[PDB]
Amino acid sequence: VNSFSGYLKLTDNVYIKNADIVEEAKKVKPTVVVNAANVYLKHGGGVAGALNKATNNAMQVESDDYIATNGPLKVGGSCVLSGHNLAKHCLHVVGPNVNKGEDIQLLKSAYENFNQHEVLLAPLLSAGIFGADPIHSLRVCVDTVRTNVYLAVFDKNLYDKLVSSFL
Ligand SMILES: CCc1c[nH]c2ncnc(NC[C@@](C)(O)C(C)C)c12
């Protein structure tokens, strides 16, 4: 039993809700919140900009130190950093950014990072400003992630479309 509330159950291990991941994380304080990161951990917009804003820019400060030490992530890769006031940990996961021309096959590799964590609060990878089809992102999520994932979808219209078209 966990503290996630109001989710619809899609499969044995995947759940979904129309919710702002920022407000959801502040309420649940999950062990792991997933950030829709880029390889430079420059949290400018989309989910990343919103999560970072909620940390009063502390996420960005931590991230800049991480990059200065380690260099950029790989597309499809991830790193675990602090969750600040939102979660115990933030798993920064880099899905491909279609608006940069990055291979969509890397979306599966990106979701594989979720399997290192027993429970996660997460956005759909590569959705929104990363330019991928969210219906496809949900399909890859369900077919790749084996751990318990709680997907927060900001747009109510998109949430309804995702539920109604799920196979
Ligand atoms: C600023 C973006 C954002 C803030 N809080 C969020 N929580 C969840 N998802 C988000 N964006 C991705 C998306 C695919 O769900 C959306 C575009 C329908 C956000």
Short mmCIF file of all heavy atoms in Angstrom, two decimals, residues 25 29-33 51 54-55 59 62 80-92:
data_model
loop_
_atom_site.label_atom_id
_atom_site.label_comp_id
_atom_site.label_asym_id
_atom_site.label_seq_id
_atom_site.Cartn_x
_atom_site.Cartn_y
_atom_site.Cartn_z
N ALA A 25 3.80 15.80 -6.52
CA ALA A 25 5.00 15.48 -5.76
C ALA A 25 5.00 16.16 -4.40
O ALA A 25 5.35 15.54 -3.39
CB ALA A 25 6.26 15.86 -6.55
N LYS A 29 5.13 13.43 -1.74
CA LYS A 29 6.54 13.30 -1.37
C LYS A 29 7.04 11.89 -1.69
O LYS A 29 7.51 11.18 -0.80
CB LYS A 29 6.77 13.63 0.10
CG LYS A 29 6.73 15.11 0.44
CD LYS A 29 7.89 15.87 -0.19
CE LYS A 29 8.61 16.75 0.82
NZ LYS A 29 9.67 16.02 1.57
N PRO A 30 6.96 11.47 -2.95
CA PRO A 30 7.33 10.09 -3.28
C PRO A 30 8.82 9.87 -3.10
O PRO A 30 9.62 10.81 -3.02
CB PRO A 30 6.95 9.98 -4.76
CG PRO A 30 7.15 11.36 -5.28
CD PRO A 30 6.67 12.25 -4.17
N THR A 31 9.19 8.60 -3.04
CA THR A 31 10.61 8.25 -2.99
C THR A 31 11.34 8.76 -4.22
O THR A 31 12.46 9.27 -4.11
CB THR A 31 10.76 6.74 -2.86
OG1 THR A 31 10.01 6.27 -1.72
CG2 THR A 31 12.22 6.36 -2.68
N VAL A 32 10.71 8.63 -5.39
CA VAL A 32 11.33 9.01 -6.66
C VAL A 32 10.32 9.79 -7.49
O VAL A 32 9.23 9.29 -7.79
CB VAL A 32 11.83 7.80 -7.46
CG1 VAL A 32 12.46 8.26 -8.77
CG2 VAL A 32 12.82 6.96 -6.64
N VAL A 33 10.69 11.01 -7.87
CA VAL A 33 10.02 11.74 -8.94
C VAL A 33 10.93 11.75 -10.16
O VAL A 33 12.14 11.98 -10.04
CB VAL A 33 9.58 13.17 -8.55
CG1 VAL A 33 10.76 14.09 -8.32
CG2 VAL A 33 8.67 13.74 -9.64
N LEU A 51 9.42 21.60 -12.36
CA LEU A 51 10.00 20.99 -11.17
C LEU A 51 11.08 21.89 -10.57
O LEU A 51 11.12 22.09 -9.35
CB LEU A 51 10.58 19.61 -11.50
CG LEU A 51 9.56 18.52 -11.86
CD1 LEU A 51 10.27 17.28 -12.36
CD2 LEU A 51 8.68 18.18 -10.67
N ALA A 54 9.71 24.85 -8.70
CA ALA A 54 9.16 24.46 -7.41
C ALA A 54 10.24 24.25 -6.35
O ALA A 54 9.94 24.35 -5.16
CB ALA A 54 8.30 23.20 -7.55
N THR A 55 11.48 23.95 -6.76
CA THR A 55 12.61 23.85 -5.83
C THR A 55 13.33 25.18 -5.62
O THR A 55 14.41 25.19 -5.01
CB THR A 55 13.65 22.81 -6.30
OG1 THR A 55 14.44 23.34 -7.38
CG2 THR A 55 13.01 21.49 -6.70
N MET A 59 17.30 22.67 -7.67
CA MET A 59 17.56 21.59 -8.61
C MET A 59 18.58 22.00 -9.66
O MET A 59 19.50 21.23 -9.97
CB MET A 59 16.24 21.14 -9.26
CG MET A 59 16.39 20.05 -10.31
SD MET A 59 14.82 19.57 -11.02
CE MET A 59 14.16 18.60 -9.65
N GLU A 62 22.17 22.20 -8.11
CA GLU A 62 22.72 20.86 -7.94
C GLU A 62 23.12 20.27 -9.29
O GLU A 62 24.16 19.61 -9.42
CB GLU A 62 21.68 19.99 -7.24
CG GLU A 62 22.10 18.55 -7.07
CD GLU A 62 20.95 17.64 -6.71
OE1 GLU A 62 19.82 17.93 -7.15
OE2 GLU A 62 21.19 16.64 -6.01
N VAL A 80 20.56 9.93 -10.78
CA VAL A 80 19.80 10.14 -9.56
C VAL A 80 20.40 11.32 -8.82
O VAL A 80 21.60 11.31 -8.49
CB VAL A 80 19.80 8.89 -8.67
CG1 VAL A 80 19.03 9.15 -7.39
CG2 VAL A 80 19.23 7.70 -9.41
N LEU A 81 19.59 12.32 -8.54
CA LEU A 81 19.98 13.47 -7.75
C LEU A 81 18.95 13.67 -6.65
O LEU A 81 18.01 12.88 -6.50
CB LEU A 81 20.16 14.71 -8.64
CG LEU A 81 21.37 14.65 -9.58
CD1 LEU A 81 21.37 15.83 -10.54
CD2 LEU A 81 22.68 14.62 -8.78
N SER A 82 19.13 14.73 -5.86
CA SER A 82 18.19 15.01 -4.79
C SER A 82 16.80 15.32 -5.34
O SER A 82 16.64 15.90 -6.41
CB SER A 82 18.65 16.21 -3.98
OG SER A 82 17.75 16.50 -2.94
N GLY A 83 15.78 14.94 -4.57
CA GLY A 83 14.43 15.37 -4.84
C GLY A 83 14.06 16.69 -4.20
O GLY A 83 12.93 17.15 -4.39
N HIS A 84 14.96 17.29 -3.42
CA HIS A 84 14.74 18.62 -2.83
C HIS A 84 13.47 18.57 -1.99
O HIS A 84 13.30 17.63 -1.20
CB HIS A 84 14.81 19.69 -3.90
CG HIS A 84 16.13 19.71 -4.60
ND1 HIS A 84 17.22 20.39 -4.10
CD2 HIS A 84 16.55 19.07 -5.71
CE1 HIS A 84 18.26 20.18 -4.90
NE2 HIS A 84 17.88 19.37 -5.87
N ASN A 85 12.58 19.55 -2.11
CA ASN A 85 11.34 19.61 -1.34
C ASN A 85 10.22 18.81 -1.98
O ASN A 85 9.10 18.84 -1.48
CB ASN A 85 10.90 21.07 -1.18
CG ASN A 85 10.86 21.81 -2.51
OD1 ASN A 85 11.75 21.67 -3.35
ND2 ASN A 85 9.81 22.60 -2.71
N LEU A 86 10.48 18.11 -3.08
CA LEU A 86 9.43 17.44 -3.85
C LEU A 86 9.38 15.93 -3.65
O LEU A 86 8.31 15.34 -3.81
CB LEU A 86 9.63 17.73 -5.33
CG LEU A 86 9.67 19.21 -5.73
CD1 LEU A 86 9.94 19.35 -7.22
CD2 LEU A 86 8.37 19.91 -5.37
N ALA A 87 10.51 15.31 -3.33
CA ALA A 87 10.63 13.86 -3.27
C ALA A 87 11.94 13.55 -2.56
O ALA A 87 12.78 14.43 -2.38
CB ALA A 87 10.67 13.26 -4.68
N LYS A 88 12.13 12.29 -2.18
CA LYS A 88 13.44 11.90 -1.66
C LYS A 88 14.51 12.06 -2.73
O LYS A 88 15.54 12.72 -2.52
CB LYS A 88 13.39 10.46 -1.14
CG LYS A 88 14.64 10.06 -0.38
CD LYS A 88 14.49 8.69 0.26
CE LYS A 88 15.62 8.40 1.24
NZ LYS A 88 16.95 8.42 0.58
N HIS A 89 14.25 11.50 -3.92
CA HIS A 89 15.18 11.51 -5.03
C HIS A 89 14.48 12.01 -6.28
O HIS A 89 13.27 11.83 -6.46
CB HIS A 89 15.69 10.10 -5.35
CG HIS A 89 16.32 9.41 -4.18
ND1 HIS A 89 15.71 8.40 -3.48
CD2 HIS A 89 17.53 9.60 -3.60
CE1 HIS A 89 16.52 7.99 -2.51
NE2 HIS A 89 17.63 8.70 -2.57
N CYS A 90 15.25 12.63 -7.17
CA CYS A 90 14.81 12.90 -8.53
C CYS A 90 15.63 12.06 -9.49
O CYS A 90 16.86 12.15 -9.52
CB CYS A 90 14.91 14.38 -8.88
SG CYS A 90 14.38 14.73 -10.59
N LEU A 91 14.94 11.24 -10.28
CA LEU A 91 15.56 10.50 -11.37
C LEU A 91 15.43 11.35 -12.63
O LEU A 91 14.33 11.49 -13.18
CB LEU A 91 14.88 9.14 -11.54
CG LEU A 91 15.47 8.28 -12.65
CD1 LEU A 91 16.87 7.80 -12.28
CD2 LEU A 91 14.56 7.09 -12.94
N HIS A 92 16.54 11.96 -13.05
CA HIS A 92 16.56 12.76 -14.27
C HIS A 92 16.76 11.81 -15.44
O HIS A 92 17.81 11.18 -15.55
CB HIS A 92 17.71 13.78 -14.21
CG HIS A 92 17.55 14.79 -13.13
ND1 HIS A 92 16.85 15.97 -13.31
CD2 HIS A 92 17.96 14.78 -11.85
CE1 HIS A 92 16.86 16.64 -12.18
NE2 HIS A 92 17.53 15.95 -11.28
#
